[PDB]
Amino acid sequence: NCHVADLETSLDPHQTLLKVQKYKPALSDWVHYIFLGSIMLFVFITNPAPWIFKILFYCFLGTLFIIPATSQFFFNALPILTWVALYFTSSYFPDDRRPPITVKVLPAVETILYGDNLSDILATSTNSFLDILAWLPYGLFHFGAPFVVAAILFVFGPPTVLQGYAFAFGYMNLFGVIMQNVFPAAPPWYKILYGLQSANYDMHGSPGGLARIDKLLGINMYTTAFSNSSVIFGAFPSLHSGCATMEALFFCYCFPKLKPLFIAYVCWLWWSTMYLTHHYFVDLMAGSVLSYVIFQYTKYTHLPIVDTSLFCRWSYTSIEKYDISKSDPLAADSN
């Protein structure tokens, strides 16, 4: 029997319920589940949608959570669902119950801590080749990357690496949404277009350089899609940068041999985001430090120890959780 390798092949909810009978939590798990269920049911009550639609959705979600195979998948996916639900519900928050827009704080922190307005620096001179070079990681690889990371981490990573990936990705995006709602901020194209004056939630967003991309390949793909968005002032912390950093950290954790590639990818994505005038550098750095700390916790916790002689998941015959106490250089005088 190769239990570690194989997924769950049982289909009876009784097993799940008896596991919940058996499982023992700690304060970590108490606050985890209390917080996540809190957000879930808050979204249930809020989020204007027909009550029958919402009841059916949550009932299907529950019966998907409770059946062992789909249970393990979607129960681990839980934080991602919380992120998505809270994001759209927050799109349905009321206009004058959310904080005022800070159009002056991000340029201040950036010019103070990093020299100049780096978005303006990288956008001083633009052309078509650079427009495409920025369009790729912004609009294509950003959206395709979480699923590719899941597939590659599932096959080539050790077992249960994907659980930690789901946990870290979900909590990163959740804290990102919470901090975007707590602290609103106008992205750089706002200073480019209007300048320094004060904003309000009754103005439409703008693409930036994706407008040039739209002109290039003749659609209107992005102008309409942006200019009626609800996260216009949602440019702190970065979520493009946070996601890119999380994906690259997990690639560098699972594949430690071809590592420079992923750092080059992240720098490509940061340049792409500040090229199209969608972020300040402090935005990307809030996102990146958030993702970094989250991943450090999740790696010196939950995540297992990768092996280097083993090809793919189905050749891993053990789960090995990291150990803070032994591994430290500043040991207990073991020799």
């Binding site: 998505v84 942006f226 968005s229 493009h240």
Partner: peptide
């Protein structure tokens, strides 16, 4: 898809 825009 309007999340973190892809097509709808």
């Amino acid at each position: 898809i309007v999340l973190x825009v892809f097509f709808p």
